[PDB]
Amino acid sequence: KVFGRCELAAAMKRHGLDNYRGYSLGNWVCAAKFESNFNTQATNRNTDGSTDYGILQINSRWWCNDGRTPGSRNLCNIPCSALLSSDITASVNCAKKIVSDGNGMNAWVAWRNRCKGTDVQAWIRGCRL
Ligand SMILES: [Cl-]
Ligand SMILES: [Cl-]
Ligand SMILES: [Cl-]
Ligand SMILES: [Cl-]
Ligand SMILES: [Cl-]
Ligand SMILES: [Cl-]
Ligand SMILES: [Cl-]
Ligand SMILES: [Cl-]
Ligand code: NA
Numbered sequence: 001k002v003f004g005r006c007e008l009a010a011a012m013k014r015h016g017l018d019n020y021r022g023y024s025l026g027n028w029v030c031a032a033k034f035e036s037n038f039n040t041q042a043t044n045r046n047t048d049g050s051t052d053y054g055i056l057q058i059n060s061r062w063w064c065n066d067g068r069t070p071g072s073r074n075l076c077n078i079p080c081s082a083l084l085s086s087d088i089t090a091s092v093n094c095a096k097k098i099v100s101d102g103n104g105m106n107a108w109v110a111w112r113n114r115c116k117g118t119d120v121q122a123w124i125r126g127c128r129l
Pocket of ligand 7 (some may be wrong): 087089
């Protein structure tokens with residue numbers, strides 16, 4: 001599923017991401033925009049052989065199992081395929097664990113490089129929430 005901007009904002013808020021660990025909803029929408037362009041089916045291989053999955057490009061090196069990332073962990077206790085669902089529940093639950101890991105949203109390099117410090121409220125501008 002390819003979400004619209006406000007549609008995703010609404011789903012993320014519904015699933016309790018809004019202000020989770022102090023990160024306003026616009027941060028999460030901005031991260032999703034640059035990680036996946038709002039596409040739940042997005043997958044991208046990393047140079048190290050891990051793969052990133054879903055709207056928030058969660059990495060198989062630490063967080064999900066894809067059966068082909070040697071030496072990795074599965075700290076969200078899910079198959080990475082679960083992270084590609086049209087229903088964002090698995091991605092949200094796993095993102096809550098990631099963002100609680102110590103470095104906040106810096107875990108998402110695109111968030112650090114493209115969202116952090118910017119006017120992230122623009123991402124939820126005009127949305128019925
Ligand atoms: Cl957009
Ligand atoms: Cl915001
Ligand atoms: Cl593996
Ligand atoms: Cl393969
Ligand atoms: Cl594990
Ligand atoms: Cl699995
Ligand atoms: Cl959903
Ligand atoms: Cl933080
Ligand atoms: Na893994």
